[PDB]
Design a protein around this ligand. Structure first.
Ligand code: 7SH
Ligand code: 7SH
Ligand code: CA
Ligand code: CA
Lengths: 123, 123
């Protein structure tokens, strides 16, 4: 008989995005081609099987820079990082394949499943 | 026309609680009477006006221990910390006043408002 606050998690997440936008307590840079994106390892770990697997390792947890593979589309990554911090996924025919490839690489099932639904719902 | 993932923020928050429960990337201890609670400053800042005000200050951001006032009820704090990381508030006649005093101190409006509703809904 606890009281569930349906909007609390969204409120937290939006505030974490504000922290990211002000570089407050960010602790890692993700390098994708010529792009650098700062973020919070905790959020990355909470949103991605790949990042979880990297930073849960006692040896790799202290890394401050992670390089993603050169074949990763930087726009795909930016779209997924924004999703991580906002719950909103900008998905369009022009980017679905990049988003889906990136979400598979990052090990983000809900997004991959949604890309499947997008595909199934397009002609 | 972005796709909103209604459960994403909750999924993130639950994973952040798992990180807390394993002391992964925790960076502060909150001391309330004889109790010590480890947490993530980012989450505290995202959930509390008091903690936001403390750690947004460039001078106090690097603190690893925060002492709360001796008159703060440690159970009230534990209840609110759990709420921060789960969205679930364990509110009962036996603890409402402690929870509400602690939520006012921590500057958590939604919880304070809910305590008001609890009061208004009790005889
Ligand atoms: C080839 N391929 C593989 C896949 C996959 C997969 C499965 N998977 C695994 N790990 C994941 C997640 C998601 C996740 C979370 C919210 C989302 O909204 C989405 C989306 N969207 C994803 C996060 N974490 C990491 C994780 O659990 N942290 C964790 C575990 C235990 N204690 C503490 C921590 Cl922090 C996830 O989906 C997709 N394609
Ligand atoms: C005497 N009294 C005062 C009050 C109050 C108040 C107002 N207040 C202020 N700051 C707050 C919050 C809540 C909050 C969030 C989710 C919740 O579910 C609840 C609850 N529940 C609370 C969080 N933050 C901190 C904040 O905004 N971080 C922030 C701001 C800008 N960029 C980055 C960051 Cl991280 C808040 O409610 C209540 N009683
Ligand atoms: Ca490579
Ligand atoms: Ca005092």
């Amino acid at each position: 008989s606890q009281i569930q606050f349906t909007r609390h998690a969204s409120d937290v997440l939006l505030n974490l995005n504000r922290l990211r936008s002000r570089d407050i307590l960010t602790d890692v840079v993700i390098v994708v081609s010529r792009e650098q994106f700062r973020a919070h390892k905790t959020v990355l770990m909470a949103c991605s099987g790949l990042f979880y697997s990297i930073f849960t390792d006692q040896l790799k947890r202290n890394l401050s820079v992670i390089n993603l593979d050169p074949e990763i589309n930087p726009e795909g990554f930016n779209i997924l990082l924004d999703f991580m911090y906002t719950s909103r996924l900008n998905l369009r025919e022009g980017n679905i394949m990049a988003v889906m490839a990136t979400a598979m690489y990052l090990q983000m099932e809900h997004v991959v499943d949604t890309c499947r639904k997008f595909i199934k719902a397009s002609e």
